[PDB]
Design an enzyme around this catalytic site. Sequence first.
Site: not given
Length: 223
Positions: A40, A54, A57, A84, A171, A175, A177-178
């Site tokens: 997805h 970061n 940066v 997925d 949890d 963002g 995801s993957g």
Amino acid sequence: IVGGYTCGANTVPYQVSLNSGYHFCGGSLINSQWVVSAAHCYKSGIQVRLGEDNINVVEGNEQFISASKSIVHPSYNSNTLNNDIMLIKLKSAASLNSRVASISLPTSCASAGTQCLISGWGNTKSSGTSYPDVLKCLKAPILSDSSCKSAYPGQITSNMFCAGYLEGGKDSCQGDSGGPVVCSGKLQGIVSWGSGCAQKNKPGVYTKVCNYVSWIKQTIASN
Ligand SMILES: NC1=NCc2ccccc21
Ligand SMILES: [Ca+2]
């Protein structure tokens, strides 16, 4: 990641950020030229960013490498999120070091109760939105198939597992995801979905990587 901790720079050396002008998903480096992520997360124009802490940066350990190809699993269903998983090939091999390193694929599937490490740059709030910029981490156990299916009736396939806490509070989130779920030094999961983040009785759901080892190995061997 909601309810996690700051990992520390480059302490998760297989974690990558997928960037298309901005971070949009995580992934896991599985050899010098291939990343595992969620289907997805597919889009064109992906740059893989390795060695990140970061993401806003340039800190000095990054490698930025454009993708040459993406391969979404042939059986991915975007409505059910079954299968997925996708593979992303780097145009050039990453330089591997202590801070940029591959994660091994599993030899066998991990069991409910096994502790794992989940990581990412996703939202840290269950209500509202805040993105952390440095990498966040969460230690969480795999939940039983029974409790996963009781939490999400009609939605959990044999290619998914739940991990986290039925009480909520901790949890993965938008963002993340993957990105990786690593247990005993092996990539066992991919951050896939959940209903809200860190809500009671709605743990995170993860792609079950052990079901895909043959597909991953064969695909890499011919692409
Ligand atoms: N665990 C998760 N809850 C919501 C969500 C969105 C994206 C990835 C993972 C999750
Ligand atoms: Ca950076």
